[PDB]
Amino acid sequence: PEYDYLFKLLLIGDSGVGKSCLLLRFADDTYTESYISTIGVDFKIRTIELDGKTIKLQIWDTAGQERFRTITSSYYRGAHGIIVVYDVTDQESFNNVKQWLQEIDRYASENVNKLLVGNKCDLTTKKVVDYTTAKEFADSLGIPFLETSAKNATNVEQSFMTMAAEIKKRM
């Protein structure tokens, strides 16, 4: 369990968008439809390999529900990267990405890396948030962007690798 880099990541975004499922897909290679709202935070560790380097990732999965966001400033301490997740089948969750980003500005390090993830892309006929409108937004702020499916595993590994790559190059 040696490593060349050690990055603290947060997942944030509306309740029900799939933060925990992204976490569980990436860290445990599992998926379940049974749901319990995240009460405070969950925490998983996983190592990847990028450009021949071993990167240990500490991944914190936060509550989407405002009533459980009492100590958020504390979760941001030492965070290298933040992944903002919305549900591609839910317009409100995408509309709220602006406010989530303003939470990053408020609590995170000035140079923190950011990544936009649109989850549940397997729901092809339920998608209401267009890829181009999402990506235009991401691009307007220099934020990398991907659509994922925790359920089918699509782009999940790539997302964390893209985040780890952003952070690695600013070191």
Partner: protein, 192 residues
């Protein structure tokens, strides 16, 4: 419930001032966006009130304020206190009418309806605010406990021995259980 220690009060006031300063920069940066500016101002006002409430506990710990009961007689601890008042203040009470005023000034306000009404208002507001400060104090205390858990959940989980990691895992459960209680505390506060 143990009170917040002075070190805890100082650590919170410092984080709140820092957060306040950041909200100000942000208001400047989003000027023209009336929705975000309005929400940032609401946050800033909230942080400012919490700061002022922490300052009262600070003053109490440094003697600039003293805890007293409903009649204005000195008391030992915060749980016993009904108001925290300044060195130069006193309570006058009769048959369920309570006045908070500057020491020695009863002669000056006795026949003055405006000063009378002000003294009653200040008494009631002071009592209600101390109630607010007690509630926030508990929330701050609990929150600081959860924060120091994170630091600890971290290294434990860093370790590879299924013992310290299984510990971290029970520490995380406990942390989350506290978050349930903290949220409910926040709910009562909002009612008061």
């Amino acid at each position: 419930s143990e009170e917040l220690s002075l070190s805890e009060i100082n650590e919170k006031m410092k984080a709140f001032s820092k957060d306040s300063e950041k909200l100000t920069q942000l208001m400047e940066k989003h000027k023209g966006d009336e929705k975000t500016v309005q929400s940032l101002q609401r946050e800033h006002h909230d942080i400012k009130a919490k700061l002022a409430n922490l300052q009262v506990l600070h003053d109490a710990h440094t003697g600039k304020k003293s805890y007293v009961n409903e009649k204005g007689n000195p008391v030992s601890s915060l749980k016993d206190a009904h108001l925290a008042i300044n060195k130069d203040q006193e309570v006058v009470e009769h048959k369920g009418q309570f006045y908070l005023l500057q020491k020695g000034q009863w002669d000056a306000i006795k026949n003055d309806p405006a000063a009378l009404e002000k003294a009653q208002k200040d008494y009631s507001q002071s009592k209600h605010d101390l109630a607010t400060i007690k509630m926030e104090a508990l929330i701050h205390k609990l929150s600081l406990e959860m924060e120091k858990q994170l630091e600890t959940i971290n290294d434990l989980i860093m370790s590879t021995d299924p013992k310290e990691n299984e510990e971290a895992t029970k520490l995380l459960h406990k942390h989350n259980g506290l978050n349930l209680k903290l949220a409910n505390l926040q709910d009562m506060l909002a009612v008061h």
